[model samples]
Target: FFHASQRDALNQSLAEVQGQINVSFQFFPPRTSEMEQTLWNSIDRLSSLKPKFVSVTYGRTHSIIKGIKDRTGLEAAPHLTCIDATPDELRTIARDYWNNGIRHIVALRGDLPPGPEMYASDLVTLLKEVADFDISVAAYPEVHPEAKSAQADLLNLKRKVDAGANRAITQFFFDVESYLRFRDRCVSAGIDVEIIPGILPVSNFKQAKKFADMTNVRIPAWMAQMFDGLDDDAETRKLVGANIAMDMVKILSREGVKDFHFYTLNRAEMSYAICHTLGVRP
Candidate 1:
């Protein structure tokens, strides 16, 4: 991300990882004009992959991300949250996205912004009136911070599926068994949607662990053990991280999953190496 020289090191790693798998990349909302240029430059770099579809997220609503639909050649799926916008606002976005050739929408009930109370009582209550897209909702395998109980959580999940959410991208989780269990439960509960696990291919143990804490997401003890003595050893840390992700993917692929939605945190090596391990390359 710093210079072309850096990208060469990145490309070698990515070439190993992205062997044959179809991938999708994500980016944040670009704020300033200079930032916007940098974003496009990044897009230009990633577009060579011919991804399944690249996605972008916002602070809350679609208005915060306008130019992305036109910048990248891939079908851009902009994530939309029912946290801050009204029904009318959502409708406008849906229409505009459809007009701009976007077919996918990742629907979310995002974290409330600096609030003392829950934004609304129900998920259906906020975007009850909004519909019409290839919509994807968010899921959690482990217990949620706000969930009332396991029974209550299943009921809430079913509500979203019933509300026309056809695909569900899970919250980032470390336990593959938990994801498999959650998928089985969804099947038994009759909430049938594509429950795609969000695989975050990353390094930075301290940051990853802290992030999980903020969201009530879990990090298995064994995962921490893998990076135990790699402090200041970035190259080894990179290798360990890639190996870790590849093993997780192998476990999932054995479970009959053929697709993955990776959260590629802009750094290229770990993701590239994981894909390499999976036999995915240019």
Candidate 2:
């Protein structure tokens, strides 16, 4: 039996969503047969929920996208980053993706390459030129680490949107208030594109901390305290992770955010449970 307070909180969260939310998942390609099996299994489970779309990260993304489409019949977006590829090469890749019936692309500048290095805005422009592809570019609610300033990052996003990027998916952040503030700034800047929040359920606090350090995402102090001293308890960590993610979605949904993108980390149980709590069902 669950505590009354806990049950009430759960019910309230579900009531807020009312099954009127959209979700998308991101997965990375597997390197070995065992990993491939796990990836397919995760996809098989989550596909039943009918996400708006699923995206495969760069690195053999074309094959992974094709596999996802063939296996689950879900619209799969492939990450297209401008890294070490000549403009002609990128054009050819975009053409092939279009000809193969892929309409959505997650365009990125890739990791800061050590150039006349193309920016994500440039990639967005090239993708639009290739075809009227539905594109998603990355956003930084906490401001990008490499950005000169928050205003500079916001202007860069506006540039991408102006280049015809359809939407922006933020880097994962636990500070929901910061995301809301960033969204407000986006509107004030005249960047009128859907800014979907990227939610990552952190089952491994150590790994998550490392990701936060690298991406400039701040893990709330309370979150660290919650995961403290539970290093060896994987199951309890997952339960905590799901509850945290669910609470975030509830708050975001109440704030009128209708779409969410989950970084699944090539696993389904946590993401599935979080979605299930939001009344997302097969």
Candidate 3:
């Protein structure tokens, strides 16, 4: 669904990534020094483009997270989850972030909820009670795998907004129609927070399928067919992956959804290629 004029159109729309358009990048805390260097390099490249914000998973060492903010001069929103920690312990973590110049959080219902884990809505309420965090809760266009039904999933998202969520970043989905239908249902339910679409530029089809299964995001057969026997063709796979993401974003842009959240998954090329295609330049 790409067009020749798409670049020109995106050029006008992406005048300023933070102003004319709303785009953000998401990364996780790296384990190795090599991975850390790669993460910082990715940030450095994407920073000058002025993403609305950069996000990381739960808490990393304070110095590492603090260093990112210092190096990029961009607001870093660390995810605050209600897994493996009690309500009180989670509160302490939120307070710690607030004390360290963090005012935003990506609140989530962590996988494999540990002892005394709470739902995302409960986390939103708990954090609001402590500080006025600009919280962004997770949404699921295809419905969370743990949710009982579609309507139930929508209600769960609404609960977080009612509890003081500023926005909802949906789980990664491939179907544009699915996202559009979900957006309509949210409007009908009177939940008016900006539900930013989570975009994942697939670098590995097999791995993506595994993730899709866990998250309940249906991957269409056509999408799989695109990469059908190309396990040995990494270059072609990357090209197709980037185009798929660009096509998805362009379709959403036409529907008046300007903001996008990229699940970078620690590989910059795929996400970066899509950003470049969308006219987000350094």
The best candidate in terms of TM-score: 2
Better of 1 and 3 by lDDT: 3
Model 3: number of backbone collisions: 0
Candidate 3 TM-score over all chains jointly? 0.91
Candidate 2 has what TM-score?
Answer: 0.94
Per-residue lDDT of model 1, residues 171-196, tens digit only: 78888999999989989889878688
CA RMSD of each candidate after superposition: 7.8, 2.9, 3.0
- The TM-scores, one per candidate, come to 0.79, 0.94, 0.91
Clashes of each: 10, 0, 0
- Give the per-residue lDDT of model 2 (tens digit) for 97-134: 98998999999988755434788999999989889999
lDDT of 3 by residue, 1-282 (tens): 466587666756644343455789998889999998898888887787788998887636456568879988888888877777898888888899899899988888777743344788999999998999999999999998878899998998999999999999999999999999999999999999988999998868989999899888899889999989888888988888887888788778767888889999766777776777566767
lDDT of each: 0.69, 0.91, 0.84
Better of 2 and 3 by TM-score: 2
